[PDB]
Design a protein around this ligand. Structure first.
Ligand SMILES: CN1C(=O)/C(=C/c2ccccc2OCC(=O)O)S/C1=N\c1cccc(C(=O)O)c1
Ligand SMILES: CN1C(=O)/C(=C/c2ccccc2OCC(=O)O)S/C1=N\c1cccc(C(=O)O)c1
Ligand SMILES: *Cc1c(COP(=O)(O)O)cnc(C)c1O
Ligand SMILES: *Cc1c(COP(=O)(O)O)cnc(C)c1O
Lengths: 300, 300
């Protein structure tokens, strides 16, 4: 019998698809890992479950614990879904600038939202979470940017899925860096097993922090956090490619129209970079795996 | 190597999950088949690909063919996605009442929309498609309510997935009837292989046509078509349960909040009916498979 006990057991195990049309000038094979196949349509499902599992296994969840995280992204949606399956109480802080669509989605999962001043943005959401946690001991805050379970779940699931589905033939992995968990976990496993493997981090040209530049605003949701996340292991990253907003959006649109892959803007970004790498003659005949983090419908 | 050639090869093979909390008074086991795991988040992905495959295999697609279908539902989204993967031109007719969100989603896949008068509703969308097809021979119209490939793909995929994942232990399948393809295809295979198996069709109390009542408006998108669809085989249906709008919506909300299963209203409907059947003492210890047709996010 193959029946999951709950929805969190159906997280991960996402498929690879070969790009057929969005391949201009490529001399390498480009295959895309479709993180939108996760139950709530993003890669963050993996760290939502994993950060809570790790807390559970370490005895950090008490009968009165409340899950708390400042998030304006997919991690909130994943945490809300995972808390609803677990029967945990979930509080999320975010700027009051968040769309009503997003709020309704979080509340549909039974999450409670604390809206913080629009002008303070993310830092205000963090300050509010910091203060709530400091003054009420019931709160457990997963801390997606620091939590070792983020890269760990990618070592154990994402990486092995890439390894097995490519029969060890993957040569290059291309991934947008938000928390850095995905590329770090995959590199940690794959680079040791196959030392010739290479890893390309993608960030916005508009906020080129890993390249050595300065934080700036940008629309590529999920990547370009504006600082070097502690979870990221830069020594495993072989190259950084910056991607402009317009190219990221153009390639995302091409993915939907030409491959039937309706993906988010950060998937467009990662694909820009995978196309770039794929054009290099030294990469003729190589297999490039590109991570597509989420579904595009959420962005319309 | 496990790499799909395109997105249409990743349709189907959706998982079963056991309901844990939305089970009040049940004496039977209730497991849910999560059709939202399909690439465009609904069961209709299966018939989008299948109706086009059948046309291809029967030589009905010509170099200048244009796909045309009147649809205000998930079949449009599936057809748009499948046409985008295939590189076919896709035209959909629908009432101008359709939300801008829906239109943007269809156009994101490169589909072309013909908006018909709001007052004529579905019949106007059908009349427009009828007339375009009649006067331009390039149009191929899949005809989801009549196309034998609709129940066929359910015989070949959905049914076998239910059979294998339950190790032949499924006793009762509960499914909302829209086109009727799902319940028909599953019954056709399962009832012959296990003649004690039973099948429950679900329709809206607000439009109880299969029960012998009259068409009326209702919000349970995907079911209650308002007539007996030709594709449906009523002789395989063992019982009809009607479901009220409020119960359908209440159970859908409970699924999201209590199981982390964010599903559409018709999934709430099917679950109402599965809970009802599950309370009958004669069903103690039986395995009930309930089809959950789509993701809830599209409804917010
Ligand atoms: C644009 N942006 C930011 O500005 C962020 C700031 C942030 C978020 C969490 C912790 C620290 C933080 O930065 C303070 C610093 O500069 O050290 S996080 C961010 N984007 C992301 C990237 C990935 C996930 C998320 C999320 O909110 O779930 C947000
Ligand atoms: C509420 N409703 C209707 O009223 C429909 C009418 C219809 C749709 C297609 C063909 C015939 C039709 O009816 C005319 C008749 O009464 O014989 S179809 C419908 N709902 C559904 C159910 C399942 C799928 C779809 C869809 O538009 O993709 C629509
Ligand atoms: C989280 C996220 C990323 C980056 O993944 P990390 O493992 O955090 O580096 C990219 N895109 C989107 C849409 C995300 O939600
Ligand atoms: C199509 C559909 C159904 C019914 O499935 P059929 O196989 O057409 O009977 C139920 N709910 C939703 C949301 C649908 O799109």
């Amino acid at each position: 019998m193959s029946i999951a006990e709950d929805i969190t057991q159906l997280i991960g195990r996402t498929p690879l698809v070969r790009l057929r049309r969005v391949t201009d000038g490529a001399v390498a094979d480009i295959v895309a890992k479709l993180e939108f196949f996760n139950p709530a349509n993003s890669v963050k499902d993996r760290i939502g479950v994993a950060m809570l599992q790790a807390a559970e296994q370490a005895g950090l969840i008490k009968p009165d614990t409340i899950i708390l995280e400042p998030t304006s992204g997919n991690t909130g949606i994943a945490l809300a879904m995972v808390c609803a399956a677990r029967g945990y109480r979930c509080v999320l802080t975010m700027p009051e600038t968040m769309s009503l669509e997003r709020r309704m989605l979080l509340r549909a999962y039974g999450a409670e939202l604390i809206l913080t001043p629009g002008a303070d943005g993310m830092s205000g959401a963090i300050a509010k979470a910091e203060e709530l946690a400091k003054t009420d001991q019931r709160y457990f805050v997963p801390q997606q940017f620091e939590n070792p379970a983020n890269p760990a779940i990618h070592r154990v699931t994402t990486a092995e899925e890439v390894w097995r589905d490519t029969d060890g033939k993957v040569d290059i992995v291309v991934a947008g860096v938000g928390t850095g968990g995905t590329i770090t976990g995959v590199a940690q496993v794959i680079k040791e097993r196959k030392p010739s493997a290479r890893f390309v981090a993608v960030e916005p040209a508009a906020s080129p922090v890993l390249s050595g530049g300065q934080k700036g605003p940008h629309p590529i949701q999920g990547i370009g956090a504006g600082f070097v996340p502690p979870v990221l292991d830069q020594d495993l990253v072989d190259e950084i490619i910056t991607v402009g907003n317009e190219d990221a959006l153009n390639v995302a649109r091409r993915l939907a129209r030409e491959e039937g892959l309706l993906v988010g803007i950060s998937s467009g970004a990662a694909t820009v970079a995978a196309l770039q790498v794929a054009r290099r003659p030294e990469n003729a005949g190589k297999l490039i795996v590109v991570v597509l983090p989420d579904f595009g419908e959420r962005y319309l």
